[PDB]
């Protein structure tokens, strides 16, 4: 008949597709490029701005901007460009025909949801839409009705405890540390080894190094001793120009800053300790069921060894008698989209959509009451 679009704007990757199917069929970075050099050749078809995979391909001559920083949309028309590119170019579906489902982090400004709604109804004319909390969707993904979701993308990290389908909003933790700022830290520690990546195109190279070579040290101290004492730990990577760069202790030293934010300079404790401090804000009858499920979600939790490091230090904090289990499905990079794919195909959900009538009656204010 008609099958809802399920669209996750994230930071970095947009990933979008139709509801009721197994994986996204559009995944591309939410990046918008503008040319910065002088156009010399006449008659080239030179084009105002590039979006997604184009801006990645041409990035040598572009400034690349991300329109979402820390799950807040900061530039609105670059965001409209990204949605326009998703529906018309990637999915090739006219949005008037499909309900749309949109995804957001908790405890972010209301104006963000209002603008998302006003755009989807007025300029796309989407017939109905909804805005869902990223953390809630990862439990639909992993097939659970209980757990504490630890989710980290580019930008925002957040913990949301859920118990039998009730969120416990007083216990939500949000932390701005994750993902992008690991990359900006990685650039400063690489500078110490004598490589300098400044421009916005060079950051994309750093980000790919981070995805290939970084891993979480199980004990941070012993590995700094080891890498100081040896070359066995050291791996080398080849830049797009065929230079080769060599990285030692630093590759584990980068993701350690998730567990000790002091390095980058933030106030708060690491993800292990906001997770534990989130379980401690819950009433005592349910803690035993939260420790039994910790569900990782989003790509910043894909470093090798991060599950085992979490299980170790949460076990060190927690009371002795209990099972601490960490659930880290190998597919977790997509879990928010897979969960939204499930949710938008339920029939119970077909009453939940904000339909265009209710918007025309009550305006963008409705989102706050009708959605969570």
């Amino acid at each position: 008949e008609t099958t809802a679009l399920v669209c996750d704007n994230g930071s970095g990757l947009v990933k979008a597709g139709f509801a009721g199917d197994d994986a996204p069929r559009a995944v591309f970075p939410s990046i918008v490029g503008r040319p910065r050099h002088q156009g010399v050749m006449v008659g080239m078809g030179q084009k105002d701005s590039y979006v997604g995979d184009e801006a990645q391909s041409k990035r040598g001559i572009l400034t690349l901007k991300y329109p979402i920083e820390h799950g807040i949309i900061t530039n609105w028309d670059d965001m409209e460009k990204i949605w326009h590119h998703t529906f018309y170019n990637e999915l090739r579906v006219a949005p008037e025909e499909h309900p749309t489902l949109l995804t957001e982090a908790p405890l972010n400004p209301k104006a963000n949801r209002e603008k998302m709604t006003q755009i989807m109804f007025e300029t796309f004319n989407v017939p109905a839409m909804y805005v869902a909390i990223q953390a809630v969707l990862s439990l639909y993904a992993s097939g659970r009705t209980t757990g504490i979701v630890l989710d980290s993308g580019d930008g925002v990290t957040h913990n949301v405890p859920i118990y039998e389908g009730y969120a416990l909003p007083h216990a939500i933790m949000r932390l701005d540390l994750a993902g992008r700022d690991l990359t900006d830290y990685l650039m400063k520690i690489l500078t110490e080894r004598g490589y300098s990546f400044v421009t916005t195109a060079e950051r994309e190279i750093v980000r790919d190094i981070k995805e290939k070579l970084c891993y979480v040290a199980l004990d941070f101290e012993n590995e700094m001793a080891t890498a100081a004492s040896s070359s066995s730990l050291e791996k080398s990577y080849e830049l797009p120009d065929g230079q080769v760069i060599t990285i030692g202790n630093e590759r584990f030293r980068c993701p350690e800053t998730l567990f000790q934010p002091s390095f980058i300079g933030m106030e708060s404790a690491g993800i292990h300790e906001t997770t534990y401090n989130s379980i401690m804000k819950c009433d005592i009858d349910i803690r035993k069921d939260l420790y039994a499920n910790n569900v990782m979600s989003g790509g910043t939790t894909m470093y090798p060894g991060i599950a085992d490091r979490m299980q170790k230090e949460i076990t060190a904090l927690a009371p002795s008698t209990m099972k601490i289990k960490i659930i880290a499905p190998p597919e977790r990079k997509y879990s928010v989209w897979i969960g939204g794919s499930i949710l938008a195909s339920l029939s119970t959900f077909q009453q939940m959509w904000i339909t265009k009538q209710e918007y025309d009656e009550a305006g963008p204010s409705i989102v706050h009451r009708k959605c969570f």
């Binding site: 920083e69 820390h70 807040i72 900061t74 400004p109 701005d176």
Partner: peptide, 7 residues
């Protein structure tokens, strides 16, 4: 953001 942070 609007205050306590750049976005």
């Amino acid at each position: 953001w609007x205050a306590x942070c750049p976005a």
